[PDB]
Amino acid sequence: TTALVCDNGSGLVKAGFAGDDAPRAVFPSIVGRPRHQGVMVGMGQKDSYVGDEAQSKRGILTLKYPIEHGIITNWDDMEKIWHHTFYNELRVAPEEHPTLLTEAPLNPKANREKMTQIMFETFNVPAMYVAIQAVLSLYASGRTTGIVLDSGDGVTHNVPIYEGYALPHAIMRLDLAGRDLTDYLMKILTERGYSFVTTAEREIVRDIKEKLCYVALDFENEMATAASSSSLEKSYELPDGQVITIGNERFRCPETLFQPSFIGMESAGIHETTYNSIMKCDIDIRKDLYANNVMSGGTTMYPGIADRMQKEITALAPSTMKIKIIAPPERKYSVWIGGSILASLSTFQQMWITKQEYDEAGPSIVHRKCF
Amino acid sequence: TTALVCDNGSGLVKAGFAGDDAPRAVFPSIVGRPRHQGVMVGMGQKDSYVGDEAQSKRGILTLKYPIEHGIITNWDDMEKIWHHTFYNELRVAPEEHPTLLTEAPLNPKANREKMTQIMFETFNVPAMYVAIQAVLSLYASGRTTGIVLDSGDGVTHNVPIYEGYALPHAIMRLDLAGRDLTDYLMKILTERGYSFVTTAEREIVRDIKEKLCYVALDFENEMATAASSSSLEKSYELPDGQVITIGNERFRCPETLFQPSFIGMESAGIHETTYNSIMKCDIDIRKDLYANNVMSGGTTMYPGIADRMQKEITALAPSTMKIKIIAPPERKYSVWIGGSILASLSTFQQMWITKQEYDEAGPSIVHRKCF
Amino acid sequence: TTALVCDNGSGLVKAGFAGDDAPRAVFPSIVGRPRHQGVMVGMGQKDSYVGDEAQSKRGILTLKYPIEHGIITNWDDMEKIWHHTFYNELRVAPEEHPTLLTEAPLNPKANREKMTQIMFETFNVPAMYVAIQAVLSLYASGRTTGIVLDSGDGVTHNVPIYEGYALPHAIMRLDLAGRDLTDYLMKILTERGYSFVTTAEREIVRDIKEKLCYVALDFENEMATAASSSSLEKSYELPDGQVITIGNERFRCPETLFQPSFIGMESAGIHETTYNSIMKCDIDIRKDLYANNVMSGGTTMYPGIADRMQKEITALAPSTMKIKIIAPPERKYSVWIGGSILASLSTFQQMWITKQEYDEAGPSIVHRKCF
């Protein structure tokens, strides 16, 4: 009846119905189980919690993320989350509506295949379709030409599109993402005597990151400033009422995106992979890509990250070239919005993979790209 | 003149001079104060006792450990212990010799900074240097490649090194250590009617642990054996002449290292953190690390812990991979020995941090790592 | 038919039937035997007295408490008390009803095991179950989250529970309790020329304690007040008509709970063990525990003890944290009431340990915790 969109990205689940201007259900992709003691199976206890439930009671739960780097590692829990969505968050019967899923580019084929198996077995989804997150982001911007940097929690990727023609040869991917930034921050907080080691504690660190970190325009000078007595330090109140002070970690953390070597990776910085991706593309495209850098995803939510990238690319690119970073107020939901749009299109309709076809043709069908 | 080494780990102080094949002064990191009554200040009494003094008279003393989880919490007492060392145990003038200190990785920066302040203020140490315990352990083995599991009383840590190049991105740390094992044992002894609650009583439990506990190869089957009437029970004579019988606690205690959940921790077992650390490292290193697992520290002194770990890793690692656990007769002093070696090296000499530099550059210098 | 509850705590026996809003039989856990002379065995004399009988005739009896610190030391007498209950106080046939017993946490396994042996041998209890006193107290409050301080005569303990999930890693126990407070008071009364040394005299002291002692809000200032001529002194009439005057002992006694050092113990005060227990727990729980401190047990009956604890914790806890001490009018019977509730629950029913199972599985069954 009404196609629905499920941006079940690696870390945060954003679901809703096509046509709506915002997701209806947004909650963490977390499954939590009782840590300290087994469950009183003959009494009023609960084996596991999902999303906000788990987060709310995380003090006694071990939290897991079914999805890592965009790859589903725990199918039992993944299934459980989808269940939770349909019956607790949206509270609709999944067999009544088409399902548009999202996926990071360059995954094991089995990832996609297994998802569709579930959707046509555990659930009885009429028809479904799996789309690339960056592509959808571009639809949300409404631009036909550009290059998209979608960087979520589990994975970062980069997809150039020119005049409505995807360029499936310069798609790049890093497993460097928000999850690693969280972990890194968590680690360096040790320097100030702040120890966070449990999974629940990790969750706290995530919150801190989201509220205090920002991207330094000039990292080295920012460090010098932080070294001197300054106003860069901020306070933060922990759940138990304690107050902590964050100093130069407020930018030493997000900086990692521009210098992956901080965590032992050979990857070029995101400003370099953007540039390089453009260099891999035909010289007659390059100019248009430079003026249309579209950022999306939660890790682009840091204050000043656009300005930093503006600067970084400017340096790498020709002096006569106009560099323009596009970074809409709603980057966080760009992909979901794109899905809403796409699902509502009249031509899109012909791409739905029906259960009928799945049953007839078989699993291989999920990799078709006729459009 | 002759550099000296002070492995002032969290729980036991091991000091001596570089070049010696063994520590010269080994005594507990304990400061004890009169419990039952205040001190007769105008008469021949003594306000506090240190190390073996305190241990010897512990029946009337409240014992404290200045260091917890590798972090100095009571500087006044810490200072007192260093005093005791230099003037009562080694009986040398500290201003005459370079001082090599040790430290667990990932501490609050202030820990290190404050120690050096003291060394260049309360004492007048010519020059000093703070090194990581696991690293030194590797020097003691004399191997250039391996991964070190140093597990003391207050802290456990794991540091991989490849061909003389440290890999400062896969350093892991747990606050799970000998102190917790002691506490746990102390707790479960309650089951047999053995109550130990005072600090002095804790000390007794420590001794028991060290003499009767061993690591079961197959914990579950070991439990079954213990359940049946068996020879696993051992006797132990308490200081006052009473005799106690220890049964399955002889392995339910050290087992905690392989199953941290026993004490409410989310930490993976030490065999899992070893494995995982290796997985975090580059695939072309992994093989060499597998054949060079170096264990050190007092908590690796349990009978059969190497065999247990051999088994555990074997299961986790590939079937074609050769797993080799290295566990020298002298694990207890590995770090100190490593310090002896390092301090005596001709290239090492250039890393000493002089008082001059401290005064000029300031406290920040203690985190340099030029080598 | 109707499960009955027996809170046979260390010092006072509180028994009744589930569903009743109050205990049916409450009497001291005392067995008394003729002191001055042996028993005229061929004449109308009585070898021993129990509970109120013994208390009433205590002038010629030596009174003993079968239970010490929650551990049964004299099984013959314990058995006798249970006999007295069933046949003299409740006057029912024990084989007709399920028996819910209570127990302090962290006892020798043999304590529990021997009790159940008796219940399935001397008596023929259909089925039974042993529960932790603090846990039951929480049920009486009806709250699902909190931390319980149950402090009786022989033992004090502290058990945190979060959202119906017990946290069996932060259970703490002190043998400091009402019995020690009684003894201490008895001792310091010496200062005013009041000598109480016999067991019967001890009993008198207990009464005094219960009627005149209160908890000073500010002990040191309270002492200053008492030092000056004041209204703090109270009179008390002894059984033989003599009148005694109690001064600052009215608070120097209960103060011991906040300063255990008065009687030579290393234990932290009860306000510190409460705080510390909370610190041992996960940071996302802490807040809820702070707002739900539930006190129970007779030693919490002192006037103003809640206010004192409010103050003490407030100081230790963060300034933005709301500390709330819960202390219902019926603290004295909290555990028993909790038992009444639990026993009447439909899910609880499945946990009864039947004689059948005991005979088949054997004694080890008493430590099961399936729920």
């Binding site: 005597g193 702040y194 120890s195 966070f196 080691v197 902590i244 | 989880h69 606050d175 | 610190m279 940071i283």
Partner: peptide, 7 residues
């Protein structure tokens, strides 16, 4: 420690 764990 200051936050998390005691030390």
């Amino acid at each position: 420690w200051x936050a998390x764990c005691p030390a």
